Design a protein around this ligand. Structure first.
Ligand SMILES: CC(C)c1noc(=O)[nH]1
Ligand SMILES: [Mg+2]
Lengths: 149, 151
């Protein structure tokens, strides 16, 4: 169906962008809104309401650029905003080597049903935050399965 | 002070902030503003964005060595319609010979549309505008803003 094709296109754009950033160890934070509305967080960023592309996602997260400091929030198959605030988790159960990107991802996952993707700037490692837990060192296939699920 | 007028003023402020930033950093850029001649055929050659304008997004688009930096951004009213778009190259003899493909593309689109195109040189940081087949170079910040305001 058109809806199914569009979802698969979006997943492909995301995974391509994440793979490129993982290879270059570009830190990134990408939250996908689900049933819990995230408007209050979207409003803290720079509005985009842009079509998804791997190219635009990569251009957003380039280091030392206006848009790379904060989270991208995606909603209804569009990039709603960039450079958004997310709340920092106070969980004591996050790997101690991780810093504020990962804590922000976990934090938003504590209070919403959203899925957040994190690329580490230290390692290029890819992780996902959902339900207050962080799933670390994901393969490409693992990330795709989480997005399909 | 209608909403349309205020939106235009916010868009002009975003463009001029981005162009000033890129000029200072010698970030090459090529930004075409559609007017009454539709540019769909050119917009369709790029990556679709259909994005709200911001100075931040414009700057990010043109950072060197990134996916979206080569080719034109085409704006439709208060949106960035597409990036990395193809524009036709002018063969005009009035294009300074030292200028590269971005300036020739800008003049080229300006020969077949009523659009206004802004160019930032990666060599000098100089700002130029192409309109109606003519290239106007070395614009001050004030002159660019006045040209945008008049357009
Ligand atoms: C298809 C899915 C992963 C999605 N990505 O951004 C969205 O708004 N939905
Ligand atoms: Mg002069």
């Amino acid at each position: 169906t058109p809806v199914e094709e569009a979802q698969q296109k979006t997943i492909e754009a995301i995974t391509k962008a994440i793979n490129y950033m993982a290879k270059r160890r570009i830190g990134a934070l990408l939250t996908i809104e689900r049933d819990t509305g995230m408007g209050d967080y979207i409003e803290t960023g720079i509005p985009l309401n842009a079509k998804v592309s791997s190219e635009l996602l990569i251009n957003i997260f380039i280091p030392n650029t206006p848009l790379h400091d904060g989270a991208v929030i995606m909603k209804n198959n569009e990039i709603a905003a960039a450079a958004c605030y997310l709340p920092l988790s106070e969980s004591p159960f996050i790997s101690k080597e991780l810093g504020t990107r990962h804590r922000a991802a976990v934090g938003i996952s504590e209070v919403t049903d959203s899925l957040t993707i994190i690329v580490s700037e230290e390692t290029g490692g890819v992780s996902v935050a959902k339900n207050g837990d962080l799933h670390r060192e994901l393969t490409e296939e693992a990330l795709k399965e989480m997005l399909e699920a």
